[PDB]
Design a protein around this ligand. Structure first.
Ligand code: CLA
Ligand code: CLA
Ligand code: CLA
Ligand code: CLA
Ligand code: CLA
Ligand code: CLA
Ligand code: CLA
Ligand SMILES: CC(=O)O[C@H]1CC(C)(C)C(=C=C/C(C)=C/C=C/C(C)=C/C=C/C=C(C)/C=C\C=C(/C)C(=O)C[C@@]23O[C@]2(C)C[C@@H](O)CC3(C)C)[C@](C)(O)C1
Ligand SMILES: CC(=O)O[C@H]1CC(C)(C)C(=C=C/C(C)=C/C=C\C(C)=C/C=C\C=C(C)\C=C\C=C(/C)C(=O)C[C@@]23O[C@]2(C)C[C@@H](O)CC3(C)C)[C@](C)(O)C1
Ligand SMILES: CC1=C(/C=C/C(C)=C/C=C/C(C)=C/C=C/C=C(C)/C=C/C=C(C)/C=C/C2=C(C)CCCC2(C)C)C(C)(C)CCC1
Ligand SMILES: CC1=C(C/C=C(\C)CCC[C@H](C)CCC[C@H](C)CCCC(C)C)C(=O)c2ccccc2C1=O
Ligand code: SF4
Ligand code: SF4
Lengths: 33, 40, 80, 29, 62, 74, 74, 160, 732, 89
């Protein structure tokens, strides 16, 4: 059901996504090509 | 005397005296001609 | 790091080389002025960007100009 | 009333935009 | 003409005393790049009242 | 010293200490009065004791009472 | 912060009036306990509420304070 | 009337304000008594209040709905007392001050120490120069047409 | 480079944390990147624009989707004046049961009420069902994808446009004026005539029947025959109920003037006619420049020939053509300036000439929209002047523009700056002085001694358009005026009704109180301008630093010598002007809100009398209308205004935090950071972990930027809460 | 190219056609054009000011609309005549 989507996506968008993005930026700025 | 007059001629002193005089005359005018928002 | 340039308006007063906190400037022989000396910046790799030199110049407009640029440990004055 | 299928269709479209966005970003890089 | 005690107008755009009048103190004759030494009655942003200019940068005023 | 002197003088010629002394609970302390220029007189409040002035808050009246002043001549 | 603490605590848990019998009515009513625990409380139950006097001082002997309040902000 | 305003002499709100103001003072005076210095003062204050309102009433001031005087400044001479006439006063006095100041500065500029005379004014000279400002309008115009007021590009300018 | 700032070796080889900070903030200055050719610059910018467009469309798609999936549009359509529009739903795991109930008031699930006005706009344009909104969102998602593809395509080797294509001014202007603006307007009038107007009268015209439902009974016969008057006959009656056929008409193009009686908004027929007329004007104007067909004007020639014979403007406009074509910064500045004026106009004209139905009755939304556009306008204005300065420092060629109109501006710079200064001083001294006079006299209990000037000039203008209250018998306010006779049978009938109706915002009544506030706004504009203009003119050099052009647009300072040279760069002018911009916009927004608040509340007198002195604004506006907001959450409970209450306090925090960066400078912090480094290196266990980027304090300019951002964000956030909670809490 | 100096512009600035026209002809055209524009305005004014009968915007006439465009042309033509006169042609 689509109604369950708010409770399945918000946890991901506000927690999982930001974390991985920040991690990637760190790895990108800490690397010496 | 001459030297004292020079001190009295210094900028700070003269300003205070002049402003006191100006303030006084303005206050006195309002004392005798009070409450004016126009030349009558 | 930073770039320091000296112009022909120098008078060889030596004041700039006496103010540098990191020995970046020197007085070299020259013939364009009565003093017979001009300032040079042989070791700009040690310039911290203080601009004390500029503050000491007596010419109408600074004969010594410091243009801040790329930053290194030395230029950023980092003892750590 | 927007049906579940309709909502799911929208999400699929969004995904396409995302993949096409990464490419544009990586092409500008 | 630029000469001792002459009055001139500065023509150096970078000068604090541009388009202003100064008195030539001495003009060196040894071929230095900026021979004339002009003195002004107003201090610059640094507090100096003198500077050396070339003859072309100075126009006699009288 | 001049500052302290002025305060005592203003408390002798421009205050309601006597009245307050008699009824400390009701009368309000006041030791400054404004000249009647330009509606500034509104600043002269009805503190009490047939007196109108600015209510001071430095605590002079209490101190004087403790010392035993009683009069304004003192 | 210290002076504000003094002002609210006293007006809430000390100052006030007591009846002939034992009835204590504090100036602000004891609001300090449950209102000073949040920043909104200070802004509303202190600054906003206790400032009703200065803002409404015009036309009274307390008008000077209102003018000074504004002047100081400036 | 202009702007739909009403003359203050014919505005009820204006009168209401007057009555109210006086009442407030009188109510206060009641507490004090007889020739009590406080009462006499309040009594004198009401007289001033009554006078002020009367003056405004006899004037040509136009009041609004609030019963407060509103000033007119569009150039009409009917209400010149409100802005035009007082305006001339400011211009005359201000010009006087500016003119005399410029005169003194230029005068002492050629002295032995032009900067000492700015921190320690030569009172005798200043007074003389100050008195000569009553005809500043004439003097200024004369100086303009003589090319002695405005300078000519012989002044310092920025690098660009 | 081989580090984060690939576009800068200098930053890349930096051993500190600055490398990261600066790389992020210098990312979009493509012109300064290492190894940048003009061709590449243009190509990358073009592609970046495609991406921006896509973001805008995705944003619009989301609003439609969320309103359709979680909103109450259809219910609102049924009862527009008794339903609160919903934006999106709320799923916060941190909420307490009480909060779930409070925010779920009026509905069955926690929700946020929208103050963006989308419902009214969509209702007016024709939307009636949620399914329709869904289709729109899906379409925009697709368009967004197409735009992203274009960005990639034009960066490919065989599709990268040439530098010449990027500099063909004539073709672009012709196309943009005739097609982007002209034909688009024609298309819009088509929609209004085919879909919107029918809907207002109760008829449904959609993709299902648009090809078989003629917009007008006569057909296109009148159009081609020339009998255009037919399309203006039978306008909707004054008893027409919107969204229904009762009292409807058949007209499609008219010039009635005024507002629909029931919706209190502009007539749709008039808007259709408006766009049709604008269309023709733009389409004609788009045929002015030469574009490979022989006919047309050459812009360079036009500019060169315009030199006043008297010589008062020097050599005229010669040389400007090359300067503009070869400078992207000047182009951006010109654009931002014009858009800034447009945004302000939208705000000013949209609250008076209400364009959408039942928008006037939604007080909170009306308030938000005005403050929104006015603030955006300020930012857009400041940016224009900023890029103008960047132009002088980077792209100005002194030789090309010799004795040009532009160069001569930089010749009398002192005159301009000095006079602008005088204006600011005059306005400042007297405006403040008069306010303080009024405050003092009122405080002393003598309000009759206030100096209140009537805004006669403005009142005259209002009368000139028909207002009668002021009693100035002039122009349209005069029955005998030639002007009245002209439009009495055209558009005046309807206009003269609205302008003379007290329950409309068309030319609101003005009084002595408005005079003062207007002069304050004047001060703001003048002072903000002074800072910005000075920055631009004194960007290439000054007496203190005659060689400023060689250092750039933004540099920390020039040292503690020559008296001290802090904040001497042009960037600093932008920094200083931002504060003034916020102040002036704040004054403007405060004025609008308070005036309207009193009007809505039914007591216009409060503003009329208390706006004359400052205390009134503080007590009768800020203090009085803050009661609903500060009680969003109290020791006794909470309501739907809790979120707004919390944000208000949050804003204050950010604003004050900004002060730290603005007043405290680097030296102090650098020394403190050094001590912290020592500690980490000397503390056992933590010694195991170490940094790879030396920890250092923020730079001088960086701190200024950070501080300005904190100040700005807090400023906007705090007012946003107030304007919304105060209006909604009292009238909603 | 189009840059000019002095007290009068060169004829090249008047375009590819008018640059060859005589000053007098341009003057005649200018006066005629202004006349048409003024006539159109006066006549239309009557229509707008006539009681009723202008409902549905009947007052707008194609001819008068076109005629009204003479006013701007009048300005251009009169300016051009001056330029041609000074240029000698
Ligand atoms: C959209 C983002 C988001 C979401 C979904 C949540 C969700 C939650 N927060 Mg929260 N939070 C957020 C942003 C978010 N937060 C931010 C930005 C801040 C900083 C201001 C906080 C600060 C904050 C605090 C200070 C606290 C919470 C707490 C909670 C939990 C209260 C509900 C509950 O049942 O607790 C009961 C908890 C449970 C039933 C346990 C749930 C199972 C956990 C969450 C599994 C986590 C595993 C996860 C995958 C690991 C991440 C891996 C990484 C790669 C991302 C809930 C899970 C409270 C809590 O208890 O935290 C757990 C709490 O004390 N939050
Ligand atoms: C802390 C000291 C202090 C302060 C703040 C005040 C303040 C005040 N006194 Mg007060 N007073 C003081 C000490 C003080 N007094 C003392 C020690 C005495 C005993 C002599 C008095 C006796 C006294 C009397 C008798 C009266 C006051 C009054 C007043 C009020 C009006 C002041 C006034 O004259 O305004 C107006 C100010 C002037 C007329 C002075 C003119 C301004 C001068 C010319 C400027 C100074 C010139 C400058 C210094 C030149 C420099 C030259 C160089 C050599 C230095 C005012 C609230 C009056 C009052 O309240 O009436 C209701 C009043 O009647 N006081
Ligand atoms: C741009 C605004 C503006 C300006 C600069 C002026 C300027 C002026 N007005 Mg004015 N005026 C204005 C708007 C303005 N008006 C408006 C909007 C109205 C209608 C309310 C008036 C109604 C008005 C009247 C009724 C009179 C003036 C007069 C004057 C002149 C003052 C007399 C003199 O010698 O000086 C002055 C030239 C007076 C004048 O012309 O005196 C000869 C005069 O009698 N004005
Ligand atoms: C008819 C053909 C046509 C059309 C429709 C367009 C359309 C467009 N071009 Mg374009 N272009 C064309 C031909 C065309 N071009 C040609 C032939 C060339 C080669 C010479 C170019 C070269 C070109 C470049 C190099 C760029 C564009 C860009 C753009 C886009 C601008 C951004 C946008 O969406 O704003 C559309 C905005 C609106 C519709 C809103 C307009 C709002 C204004 C304010 C209305 C004003 C009304 C009125 C005047 C106000 C009155 C009040 C006033 C007095 C204050 C737009 C889609 C830019 C872009 O983003 O590319 C991706 C860009 O960089 N074009
Ligand atoms: C179409 C509009 C437009 C365009 C294309 C540009 C383009 C450009 N501008 Mg410009 N500008 C604009 C509008 C525009 N600007 C406006 C409106 C203003 C006025 C504010 C300015 C003011 C301005 C200045 C003062 C400067 C530029 C500069 C630049 C250049 C580099 C930008 C850069 O480095 O950013 C890189 C990327 C960033 C800075 C990221 C921005 C992060 C922002 C500041 C913070 C976000 C807000 C905050 C996080 C919100 C969180 C709140 C939350 C807690 C609720 C670039 C050519 C710079 C330059 O030197 O050019 C020569 C420069 O110094 N611009
Ligand atoms: C309350 C805060 C405040 C105030 C009052 C001012 C005031 C002023 N700023 Mg300012 N500013 C502020 C905050 C403030 N600033 C902040 C926070 C910033 C950071 C962005 C700036 C940044 C800034 C810049 C960048 C510039 C200014 C400028 C100015 C001046 C504009 C001209 C003017 O108004 O003349 C009138 C001034 C006043 C009314 C203020 C002083 C009033 C005193 C009390 C005198 C009153 C006299 C009174 C009328 C009676 C006189 C007669 C009496 C002697 C008898 C003015 C002095 C501009 C400037 O230099 O001016 C040309 C300018 O370029 N400001
Ligand atoms: C083609 C569709 C169309 C239709 C049906 C109308 C209908 C109307 N217009 Mg309109 N108008 C349109 C397109 C249209 N307009 C466009 C595209 C423009 C831009 C040039 C205008 C500019 C315009 C103006 C400036 C005016 C009108 C006016 C009018 C009204 C009376 C004139 C009339 O009916 O036509 C009469 C026209 C003809 C019989 C033929 C004209 C052919 C031309 C000259 C070619 C009426 C409501 C007038 C009005 O009532 O407003 C006050 C008015 O003054 N319109
Ligand atoms: C020798 C020979 O042969 O002749 C000789 C002798 C003779 C005859 C004496 C001479 C002459 C001729 C002269 C002096 C000729 C002309 C002088 C002239 C013609 C001077 C200005 C016109 C200005 C206008 C029209 C301004 C604005 C027109 C405007 C502003 C408009 O807006 C028009 C308008 O349209 C809009 C856009 C919308 C329309 O819907 C309606 C309106 C109306 C509002 C010469 C020069 O010596 C040559
Ligand atoms: C700076 C600037 O903007 O300048 C621009 C302005 C502008 C206007 C854009 C320009 C243009 C283009 C042109 C040529 C403009 C001129 C005129 C325009 C606007 C359009 C053309 C012809 C219309 C005709 C022939 C009428 C058809 C109309 C006919 C045939 C009819 O009357 C039908 C009808 O009769 C029946 C059969 C019976 C009647 O009962 C009902 C009526 C009377 C309605 C310019 C001049 O190039 C440059
Ligand atoms: C820095 C710089 C820059 C910029 C500049 C700017 C930013 C400007 C702005 C400007 C502006 C912002 C302007 C404005 C203007 C306005 C106007 C010009 C208006 C006008 C008006 C008129 C003309 C009239 C109108 C009317 C009508 C129509 C009718 C009657 C009524 C009236 C009023 C309404 C650049 C980049 C270029 C570069 C160089 C330097
Ligand atoms: C507090 C303060 C600092 C110190 C402030 C600092 C060091 C901010 C540090 C915290 C911010 C939030 C950066 C922290 C970033 C995290 C460590 C995560 C970084 C991850 C990277 C991949 C980006 C200054 O450097 C300064 C300089 C000049 C004037 C005033 C001041 C000033 O007031
Ligand atoms: S800036 Fe400092 S380190 Fe560099 S040359 Fe000058 S005095 Fe020496
Ligand atoms: S920024 Fe630093 S070096 Fe430059 S003037 Fe200010 S204090 Fe001196």
């Amino acid at each position: 059901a689509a109604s369950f989507l708010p409770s399945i996506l918000v946890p991901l968008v506000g927690l999982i996504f930001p974390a991985f993005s920040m991690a990637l930026f760190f790895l990108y700025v800490q690397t010496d090509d | 005397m001459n030297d004292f007059q020079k001190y009295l001629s210094t900028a700070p002193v003269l300003l205070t005296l002049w402003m006191t005089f100006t303030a006084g005359f303005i206050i006195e005018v309002n004392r005798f001609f009070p409450d004016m928002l126009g030349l009558y | 790091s930073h770039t320091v340039k000296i112009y022909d308006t120098c008078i060889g007063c030596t004041q700039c080389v006496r103010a540098c906190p990191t020995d970046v400037l020197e007085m070299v022989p020259w013939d364009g002025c009565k003093s017979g000396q001009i300032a040079s910046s042989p070791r700009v790799e040690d310039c911290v960007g203080c601009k004390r030199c500029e503050t000491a110049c007596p010419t109408d407009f600074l004969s010594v100009r410091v243009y801040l640029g790329a930053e290194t440990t030395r230029s950023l004055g980092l003892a750590y | 009333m927007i049906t579940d299928f309709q909502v799911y269709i929208a999400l699929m479209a969004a995904l396409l935009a995302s993949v096409l966005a990464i490419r544009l970003g990586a092409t500008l890089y | 003409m630029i000469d001792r005690n002459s009055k001139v107008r500065i023509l150096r755009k970078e000068s604090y005393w541009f388009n202003q009048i100064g008195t030539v103190a001495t003009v060196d004759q040894s071929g230095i790049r900026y021979p004339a030494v002009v003195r002004f009655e107003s201090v610059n942003y640094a507090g100096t009242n003198t500077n050396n200019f070339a003859l072309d940068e100075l126009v006699e005023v009288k | 010293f001049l500052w302290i002197s002025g305060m005592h003088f203003h408390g002798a010629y421009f205050s309601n200490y006597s009245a307050w002394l008699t009824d400390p609970i009701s009368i309000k302390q006041s030791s400054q009065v404004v000249w009647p220029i330009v509606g500034q007189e509104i600043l002269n409040a009805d503190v009490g004791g047939n007196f109108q002035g600015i209510q001071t808050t430095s605590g002079w009246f209490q101190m004087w009472r403790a010392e035993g002043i009683t009069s304004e001549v003192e | 912060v210290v002076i504000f603490h003094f002002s609210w605590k006293m007006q809430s848990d000390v100052w006030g009036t007591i009846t002939p019998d034992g009835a204590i009515s504090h100036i602000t009513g004891g609001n300090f306990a449950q209102s000073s625990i949040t920043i909104n409380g200070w802004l509303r139950d202190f600054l906003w509420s206790q400032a009703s006097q200065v803002i409404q001082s015009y036309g009274s002997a307390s008008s000077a304070y209102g003018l000074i309040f504004l002047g100081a902000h400036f | 009337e202009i702007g739909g305003l009403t003359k203050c002499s014919e505005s009820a709100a204006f009168t209401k304000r007057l009555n109210a103001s006086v009442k407030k003072l009188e109510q206060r005076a009641s507490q004090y008594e007889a020739d009590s210095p406080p009462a006499l003062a309040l009594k004198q204050q009401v007289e001033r209040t009554q006078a002020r309102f009367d003056k405004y009433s006899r004037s040509e001031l136009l009041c609004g709905a609030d019963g407060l005087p509103h000033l007119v400044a569009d150039g009409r001479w009917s209400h010149a007392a409100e802005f035009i006439l007082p305006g001339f006063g400011f211009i005359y006095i201000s010009g006087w001050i500016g003119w005399v100041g410029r005169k003194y500065l230029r005068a002492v500029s050629t002295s032995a120490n032009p900067s000492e005379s700015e921190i320690i004014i030569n009172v005798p000279l200043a007074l003389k120069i100050m008195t000569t400002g009553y005809i500043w309008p004439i003097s200024a115009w004369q100086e303009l047409i003589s090319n002695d007021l405005v300078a000519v590009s012989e002044e310092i300018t920025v690098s660009p | 480079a081989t580090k984060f700032p690939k576009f800068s070796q200098a930053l890349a080889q930096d051993p500190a944390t600055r490398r990261i900070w600066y790389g992020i903030a210098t990312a979009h200055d493509l012109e300064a990147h290492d190894g940048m050719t003009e061709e590449n610059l243009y190509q990358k910018i073009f592609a970046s624009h495609f991406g921006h467009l896509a973001i805008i469309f995705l944003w619009t798609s989301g609003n439609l989707f969320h309103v359709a999936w979680q909103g109450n549009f259809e219910k609102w359509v049924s009862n527009p004046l008794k339903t609160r529009p919903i934006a999106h739903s709320i799923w916060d795991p941190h909420f307490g049961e009480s909060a779930l109930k409070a925010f779920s008031k009026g509905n069955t699930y926690p929700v946020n009420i929208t103050f963006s006005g989308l419902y009214q706009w969509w209702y007016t344009i024709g939307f009636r069902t949620n399914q329709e909104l869904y289709k729109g969102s899906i379409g925009l998602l697709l368009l967004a994808s197409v735009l992203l593809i274009a960005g990639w395509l034009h960066l490919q080797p065989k599709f990268r446009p040439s530098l010449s294509w990027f500099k063909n001014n004539e073709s672009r202007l012709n196309h943009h004026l005739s097609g982007l603006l002209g034909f688009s307007s024609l298309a819009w009038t088509g929609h209004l005539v085919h879909v919107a107007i029918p809907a207002s009268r109760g008829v449904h015209v959609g993709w299902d029947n648009f090809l078989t439902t003629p917009p007008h009974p006569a057909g296109l016969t009148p159009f081609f025959t020339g009998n255009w008057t037919v399309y203006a006959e039978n306008p909707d009656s004054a008893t027409h109920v919107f969204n229904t056929s009762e009292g409807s008409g058949t007209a499609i193009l008219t010039f009635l003037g005024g507002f629909h009686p029931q919706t209190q908004s502009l007539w749709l027929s008039d808007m259709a006619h408006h766009h049709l007329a604008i269309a023709v004007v733009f389409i004609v104007a788009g045929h002015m420049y030469r574009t490979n067909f022989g006919i047309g004007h050459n812009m360079k020639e036009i500019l060169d020939a315009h030199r006043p014979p008297g010589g008062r403007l020097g050599a005229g406009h010669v040389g400007l053509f090359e300067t503009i074509t070869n400078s992207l910064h000047m182009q951006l500045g010109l654009a931002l300036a014009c858009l800034g004026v447009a945004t302000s106009l939208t705000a000013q004209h949209m609250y008076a000439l209400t364009p959408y139905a039942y928008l006037s009755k939604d007080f909170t939304t009306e308030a938000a929209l005005y403050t929104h556009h006015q603030y955006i306008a300020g930012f857009l204005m400041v940016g224009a002047f900023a890029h103008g300065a960047i132009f002088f420092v980077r792209d100005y060629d002194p030789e090309l523009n010799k004795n040009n109109v532009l160069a001569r501006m930089l010749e009398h710079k002192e005159a301009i700056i000095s006079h602008l200064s005088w204006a600011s001083l005059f306005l400042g001294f007297h405006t403040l002085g008069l306010y303080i006079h009024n405050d003092t006299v009122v405080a002393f209990g003598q309000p009759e001694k206030q100096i209140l000037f009537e805004p006669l000039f403005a009142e005259y203008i209002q009368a000139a358009s028909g207002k009668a209250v002021y009693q100035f018998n002039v122009l349209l306010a005069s029955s005998t005026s030639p002007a009245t006779a002209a439009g009495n049978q055209v558009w005046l009938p309807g206009w003269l009704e609205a302008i003379n109706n007290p329950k409309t915002d068309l030319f609101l009544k003005i009084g002595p109180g408005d005079f003062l506030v207007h002069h304050a706004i004047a001060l703001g504009l003048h002072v903000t301008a002074l800072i910005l203009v000075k920055g631009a003119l004194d960007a290439r050099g000054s007496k203190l630093m005659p060689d400023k052009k060689d250092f750039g647009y933004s540099f920390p300072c020039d040292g503690p010598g020559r008296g001290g040279t802090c904040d001497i760069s042009a960037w600093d002018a932008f920094y200083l002007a931002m504060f003034w911009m916020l102040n002036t916009i704040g004054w403007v927004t405060f004025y609008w809100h308070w005036k309207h608040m009193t009007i809505w509340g039914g007591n216009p007198g409060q503003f009329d009398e208390s706006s004359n002195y400052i205390m009134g604004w503080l007590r009768d506006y800020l203090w009085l209308n803050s009661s609903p907001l500060i009680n969003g959450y109290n020791p006794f409970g909470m309501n739907n205004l809790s979120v707004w209450s919390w944000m208000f306090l949050f804003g204050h925090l950010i604003w004050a935090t900004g002060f730290m960066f603005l007043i405290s400078w680097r030296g102090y912090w650098q020394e403190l950071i050094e001590t912290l480094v020592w500690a980490h290196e000397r503390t056992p266990l933590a010694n195991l972990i170490r940094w790879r980027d030396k920890p250092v304090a923020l730079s001088i300019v960086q701190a200024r930027l950070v501080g300005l951002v904190h100040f700005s964000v807090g400023y906007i956030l705090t007012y946003a809460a107030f304007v919304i909670a105060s209006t909604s809490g009292k009238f909603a | 190219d189009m840059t000019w100096e002095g007290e009068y512009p060169p004829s090249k600035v008047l375009g590819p056609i008018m640059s060859k026209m005589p000053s007098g002809l341009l003057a005649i055209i200018s006066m005629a054009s202004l006349g048409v524009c003024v006539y159109s305005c006066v006549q239309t004014g009557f229509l707008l000011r006539e009681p009723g009968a202008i409902e549905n915007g009947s007052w707008v006439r194609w001819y008068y609309v076109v005629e009204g465009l003479g006013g701007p042309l009048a300005w251009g033509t009169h300016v051009a005549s001056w330029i041609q006169r000074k240029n000698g042609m």
